């Protein structure tokens, strides 16, 4: 798994409330977080399947 899967979710400095998935490497699962709308990092996915495909295992 790519190293970016280990990074914490990044809301960023914008003020929107957009629900996105991130890979929680401590839990081994994709979970939701609030993205602010700009300056997304790589551990930020629009769907659970893309998140799991990119960063999981079981």
Swiss-Prot record:
Q: Which domain of life is it from?
A: Eukaryota
Ranges for domain BPTI/Kunitz inhibitor come to: 5-55
Q: Which GO terms describe its biological process?
A: negative regulation of platelet aggregation; negative regulation of serine-type endopeptidase activity; negative regulation of thrombin-activated receptor signaling pathway; trypsinogen activation
Task: Recall the GO molecular function terms of this protein's record.
Answer: calcium ion binding; molecular function inhibitor activity; potassium channel inhibitor activity; protease binding; serine-type endopeptidase inhibitor activity; sulfate binding; zymogen binding
Question: Gene Ontology cellular component?
Answer: extracellular space; serine protease inhibitor complex
Keywords, A to Z?
A: Disulfide bond, Pharmaceutical, Protease inhibitor, Secreted, Serine protease inhibitor, Signal
**What pairs make up the disulfide bonds?**
5-55, 14-38, 30-51
Site entry: Reactive bond for trypsin: 15-16
Location in the cell reads: Secreted
Q: What does this protein do?
A: Inhibits trypsin, kallikrein, chymotrypsin, and plasmin.
The protein in question is named Pancreatic trypsin inhibitor
Span within the full-length protein is: 36 to 93 of 100
